[PDB]
Scaffold this active site. Structure first.
Site, short mmCIF file in Angstrom:
data_model
loop_
_atom_site.label_atom_id
_atom_site.label_comp_id
_atom_site.label_asym_id
_atom_site.label_seq_id
_atom_site.Cartn_x
_atom_site.Cartn_y
_atom_site.Cartn_z
N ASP A 291 0.88 -1.15 0.00
CA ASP A 291 0.00 0.00 0.00
C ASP A 291 0.92 1.21 0.00
OD1 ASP A 291 -1.68 2.23 0.71
OD2 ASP A 291 -2.71 1.01 2.17
N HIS A 292 1.03 1.87 -1.15
CA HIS A 292 1.99 2.94 -1.27
C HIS A 292 1.72 4.06 -0.28
CE1 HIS A 292 5.29 5.02 -2.95
NE2 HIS A 292 4.88 5.12 -4.18
N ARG A 293 0.51 4.27 0.28
CA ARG A 293 0.24 5.26 1.32
C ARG A 293 1.09 5.08 2.58
NH1 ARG A 293 -6.06 4.22 1.94
NH2 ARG A 293 -5.13 2.25 2.61
#
Lengths: 243, 243, 243
Positions: free
Chosen positions: C215-217
């Site tokens: 999850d790039h967040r």
């Protein structure tokens, strides 16, 4: 967009809440806004940089006499600026009316720096007009400014394309996310010695892995394969930039 | 879905607005509708086509006597039609009630042609029933019709699966977007000579890279790896289609 | 989110409606909720398991005396538990207030089992505390329970990370979807003999392909390349887990 059901995570063991820097939250929001807005495709290619590496390493003397370290990044920046001029749909943006593209006549490129507080993408302006050691120095400056929270927001603005280089940590390829309203981002990974058919036997060539993600609304598949092919060609002989 | 903040792009340099053909805008909308609607996964595989290439090249005489050029595409079309019959979940669509899949009992396959005005995907009907040189000719016809704006919309309809071939420009692999309400699209890239372990030493085999994206709602990971494995098997010996 | 236009599919040939098990529909909904909510990136890497394979194969005696079959999975589970402890952002979740991450102090890992009715992901609890043959047995048990509809929902809960292994069917790499609210999933594909430069010539090493989606967040690109690099290092010498 349906939300994720909340789970009580402490039912399964000890938890601990660490908080997010404002920079991560900003980061987080911008990526989710890119993700839901851009239909992404990633084009993989790998380039022969055996000769580029030798160039790089032979010019270590010059670079040190100028105070810059010469890395692969100024060489990447230069080739993508040539190319962003040759294939202008890559250097452009979808107008908010969805029915036109703004072709930018300038080439400013950012690159990802991962700092403690989050990802920063400082922009180098008019990369097309700077030389390898100018680019070398500036990149280096902006990165230290970025690590040291001294990068004024003016420098995070109005880039046409982003390079994200992870060649220094490892990996074979990844699929980066486009920083909308830009239309493409080049991800670069670890170079490795690879056997390459020479028509008669396998030669070891040093191969740089490249991963171009693009906004499929603006760039089609054949335009993107032509961009990483041309880029692979330019990195295998940077002298083509001269002509 | 949050929109992208508008940026004034002329603050950073000269811009120019070029407009979008209606075909690009149509294209654009359909891809974004696919992207937000289909949870995508891409399965990579590469097939040994050393023998398929030799077949292709030996039959250049026959093909010319029939007026068709024999490329890898009719060979791809034939193998995927066999396979779409063997693994029917790939030849089907999610019913709009979200709770059933429409299994199609027919095999029509489209393929991407990138023209000046945009991407067109002409469909060849009942690919399962046509031979290699029939498929060869038809593909060729539909492509020229597509370039020359003479493809009547009847021919862009009711395909069960899409092939997108970029082998002719380059690249190592990409992640294509599913043309909903289809459930999978095969992307094909540039073939290269690769060393392949023969149990004792590395042999050079010609390897075609394949990238199957699928709608993870309908196809699971093991079904998709079984489809590109079977496809890799069929392309390494097309005579298995005979039995 | 715009819906897909309904097409009358029987205009093009015979169709047939097969229905979806409740498990597929559940599956379907959860993946689409993950997809619209998580800005995904996939990091590819491949690890040298020539020595791990030899270990595995030499301990076939021991494993049979204990009734477990030793596969690569307990070896994967052990190395990822060590690593999930070393890099805790991977073992955590975004708090629903979007502004904090819940770091879990426990390591439970699920793995995908594809059954007839759908995908199940049984969880093994406190993988960090179990040995290779314990993990071997349990994995095996939960899988048969899963195939035989005997897995009580308690066992599908509160995992910190998922492994999806398709090495047994084939493929070169894929891009798995994160099971939100987890933050990463390791996809593993078919191992192949590959030439690897030893500084002087190409040696054949057995290489396992790995595909980490994240999850790039929460995880940035450099954190993820450092995780698959460390994992590649741990699988090439599992004795590093000892120290």
């Amino acid at each position: 967009i349906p939300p994720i059901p909340p789970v009580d995570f402490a039912k399964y063991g000890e938890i601990e809440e660490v908080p997010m820097t404002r920079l991560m939250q900003i980061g987080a929001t911008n990526l989710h806004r890119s993700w839901l807005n851009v239909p992404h495709v990633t084009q993989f290619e790998s380039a022969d940089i055996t000769e580029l590496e030798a160039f790089r390493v032979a010019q270590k003397a010059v670079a040190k006499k100028a105070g810059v370290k010469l890395t692969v990044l100024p060489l990447l920046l230069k080739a993508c600026a040539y190319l962003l001029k040759e294939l202008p749909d890559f250097n452009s943006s979808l107008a908010p009316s969805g029915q036109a593209l703004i072709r930018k006549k300038y080439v400013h490129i950012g690159f990802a720096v991962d700092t403690p507080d989050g990802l920063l993408v400082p922009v180098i302006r008019n990369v097309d007009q700077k030389s390898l050691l100018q680019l070398a120095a500036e990149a280096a400056e902006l990165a230290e400014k970025a690590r040291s929270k001294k990068l004024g927001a003016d420098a995070m603005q109005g880039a046409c394309f982003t390079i994200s280089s992870l060649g220094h940590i490892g990996g074979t390829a990844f699929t980066p996310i486009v920083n909308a309203p830009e239309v493409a981002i080049l991800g670069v990974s670890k170079a490795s010695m690879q056997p390459v058919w020479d028509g008669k036997a396998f030669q070891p060539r040093l191969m740089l892995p490249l991963s171009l993600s693009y906004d499929h609304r603006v760039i089609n598949g054949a335009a993107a394969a032509r961009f990483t092919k041309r880029l692979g060609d330019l990195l295998a002989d940077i002298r083509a930039i001269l002509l």
